[PDB]
């Protein structure tokens, strides 16, 4: 439900942060954590093994199991 919307939204600012800061997903994911007044227990760590290496938000959230598919819901053109 909203986890797909939220994931797509969260993942879309991360990916739009690396594109803006010419960095990797690991760099943006860590940078995002600096903006919220201490998620690094997950992202610097839990997201490292899961995140950077595989590479849009619809794919990731579909890949990360956040947008279950049983119509294929997508925000960006496929």
């Amino acid at each position: 439900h909203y986890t797909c919307v939220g994931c797509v939204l969260v993942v879309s600012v991360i990916e739009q942060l690396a594109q803006v800061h010419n960095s990797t997903v690991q760099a943006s994911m860590e940078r995002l954590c600096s903006y919220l007044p201490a998620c690094y227990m997950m992202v610097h760590v839990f997201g490292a093994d899961i995140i950077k290496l595989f590479d849009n938000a619809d794919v990731v959230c579909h890949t990360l199991e956040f947008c279950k598919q049983e119509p294929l819901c997508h925000l960006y053109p496929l």
């Binding site: 439900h1 909203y2 919307v5 879309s12 600012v13 739009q16 942060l17 007044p37 294929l72 053109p77």
Partner: protein, 407 residues
Amino acid sequence: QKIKLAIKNSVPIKDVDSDKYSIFPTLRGYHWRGRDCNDSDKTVYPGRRPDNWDAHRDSNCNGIWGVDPKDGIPYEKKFCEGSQPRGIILLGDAAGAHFHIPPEWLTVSQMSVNSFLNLPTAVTNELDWPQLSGTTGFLDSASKIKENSIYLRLRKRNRCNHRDYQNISKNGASSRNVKSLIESLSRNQLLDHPAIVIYAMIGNDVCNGRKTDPVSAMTTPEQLYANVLKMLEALNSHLPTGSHVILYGLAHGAFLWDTLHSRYHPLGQLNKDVTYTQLYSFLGCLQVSPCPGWMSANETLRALTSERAQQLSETLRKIAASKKFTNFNLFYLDFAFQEVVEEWQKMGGQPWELIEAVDGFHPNEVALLLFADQLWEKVQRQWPDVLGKENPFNPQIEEVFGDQGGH
């Protein structure tokens, strides 16, 4: 824990004397209703008639109390005896509560540290911003707009009404669930001043049916008629005599698709790869659309949605014409959408600037204050008693009591 109860009943969590007024801003606190000047006394709260004219203490929290040393008259008697104070109460939905996701959050362009400074407040207010809303806002609009909320216009008009606002709005509110919101309304029929109540459910009656046939999910004129009647009977047993109730019609949401269907959502302004059509389709696919009827690309479905909405407005208009109540008189106002657009063009704005950027559905702060502006001017000409008289003692109250304790 009973925290759950306070949010399900839309009453503050921080409220020791349980009079529904808080010293805490968020969590249904004083961002939503006047601040409790004594959260240890259930008989001290905004909107109350003064006990012995507040000669010894401020019991209605309007900042006026004590006695004039010259004649031993209580100040609130010299400055409020005949001014006919009244409260403002909004029974509304997400728009009345001013639902707002700041564009600054989803825009990587400016994601500065100052951009997320307001997040824990927004979340504790259910992403609503009543303290900036058009009916009950009291904080200065930092948005380059010098219109004032309805409450601030009532305060400016009569400084005795200071802090007598209540925003009884819930994101998903409609005629179908307004009975819960009225339980959370605060007013003692014999001990408090009268109030203006604005009933403003401007779309949820036609904006459900996320997982069904949208038209089949909408409220029927019969359903809404019975719901609103029961609603008004309840108000009649809570509102002091001499109150006023305004029924607001439903929105002309066809405006949404027409204005935005091919405009860039803030999450697509940089890469130019997202429109509201896409957003509408994405959320519809997930069955999480805030309004399937109007946020569709299917212009027949949008036409059926507007038709039902208009049919429900005429139902509310019929009620305001044919039903009378002992403790309030009853009025009907159309959704002034057209008049808001004319007035906004004159100020150099375009229509799409009147809609929340993130959700592309609710009117934004600018539109709400314009809706308040139109309601205030229209009520004056036609129904002057509803707003009362100007109080000649505003400067003197101002000089004796300053900010009257603030907000």
